[PDB]
Design a protein around this ligand. Structure first.
Ligand SMILES: [Cl-]
Ligand SMILES: [Cl-]
Lengths: 267, 266
């Protein structure tokens, strides 16, 4: 067990799930609102933001390894001057986010000697996927409805999750199909006008919390006139980080299932 | 790369271990409990069971090639009308693991341009055998124990793995001898009454998971009275498919070594 400084939320999730408490992590108070789980221990110090971390505080913590991701790639050489850096990037244009998250989860387990716990959590995850899938095809029957997932950029713009995203993986693993399929992008997202969601005659629309202007959207004319809105096939999803690690796939699956089991028809 | 539909779990493993992602595969839900590794990609659709594959789903998936094994040999003609079929049978009264499974692994790698990846995993498998072997040598001495490997058919019946089976091959790679040697059979198994395990003294007994009636056996008079149970030379083995592909030999070796080390003399 070494002294680990983590520089991204996905990596922060990974080490925590492995039972590795980092001495340094970014934006912890914001982590509470956007990622929620796994819970960051109070012992962990905040070392700044993911894009602009406090190098002096990182050095003062005297880590043994520094874990960096895509957004930190321009600081890799400098971070290396402080401590050895393990660079595990994800959510690139050509990355399949969920598979890469799973692969990184394993490699980190190998590095920190937590392979057994990693296997146990992945096994439980794949089993959990099947349970949730069954819960859906019991409330929806077969076949399962088409689902589109997104976050709000603003009350008139939307981030649709694409083919290489982690919610897409969750949907496929849940037996769900895509209502509005999208080509692979960076971070697994493409930005759309809100009016584009009119093309979702088919089934359900799920949007991830938090969103500060949720109430404003719900009252807007463009939203109240949506096919999925008038049909009641729309719901909010409790905060699950759509740019996280291996276990974020499990959390997403449960939260999505939960929101989708609600607003489901009377069987 | 082509659109691949596989119809058996062993071939599913073989294809996944190479990096080929099939568009269709059977009983994906059960695969998680029985084969476990390697994991199945999310985009893989379930095309039914191994013995009764959904012909319409398979046709709908529009494959460029269909992979079939022994259990699908009567459907080869049917499957031909849908797409070209590659037939890679195993587990006859032949040596399944050591040769066929490994040979099919090389064959499929050539057919899909994954020869380099195949060699890397095979070399790492053999090196892994020696690691787990030396580890067992340290705990047991160079005089390694005799082992009998099986799966429960019933709470009163077991499937002993025979000379030509995959666990028997693995045991020999770990420098382990067989406590109950058995002549070659189909699937590398012979069905015996549980009572015939009373014939096992000094040897270690390992049974594979999952078995839903494990507790039922463990509570029975016949099992509790077994000489290997009283001695402590028993252990369950973490789920590794005993009728899989080449990498299942590695997975089985790790799971078996793990079980034996856990019940090694204090
Ligand atoms: Cl992040
Ligand atoms: Cl099979």
């Amino acid at each position: 067990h070494m002294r680990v400084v983590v520089l991204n939320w996905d990596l922060l999730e990974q080490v925590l799930e492995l039972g590795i408490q980092p001495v340094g992590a970014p934006e912890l108070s914001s982590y509470v609102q956007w990622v929620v789980q796994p819970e960051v221990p109070s012992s962990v110090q905040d070392i700044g933001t993911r894009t602009e971390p406090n190098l002096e505080k990182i050095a003062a913590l005297k880590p043994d390894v520094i874990l960096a991701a895509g957004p930190q790639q321009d600081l890799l050489a400098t971070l290396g001057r402080i401590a050895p850096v393990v660079y595990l990037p994800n959510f690139s244009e050509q990355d399949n986010a969920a598979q890469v998250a799973i692969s990184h989860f394993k490699t980190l387990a190998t590095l920190f000697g937590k392979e057994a716990v990693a296997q146990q959590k992945l096994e439980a995850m794949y089993a959990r996927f099947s349970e949730l899938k069954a819960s859906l095809q019991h409330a929806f029957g077969d076949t399962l409805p088409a689902v589109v997932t997104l976050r709000f950029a603003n009350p008139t713009s939307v981030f649709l999750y694409t083919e290489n995203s982690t919610p897409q993986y969750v949907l496929e693993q849940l037996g769900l199909s895509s209502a509005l399929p999208q080509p692979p992008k960076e971070w697994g997202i493409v930005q759309k006008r809100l009016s584009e969601l009119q093309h979702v005659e088919q089934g359900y629309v799920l949007y991830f919390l938090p969103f500060a202007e949720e109430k404003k959207v719900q009252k807007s004319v463009l939203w109240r006139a949506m096919p999925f809105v008038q049909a009641g096939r729309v719901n909010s999803v409790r905060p699950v980080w759509s740019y996280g690690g291996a276990m974020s796939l499990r959390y997403s699956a449960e939260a999505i299932t939960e929101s989708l089991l609600a607003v489901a028809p009377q069987s």
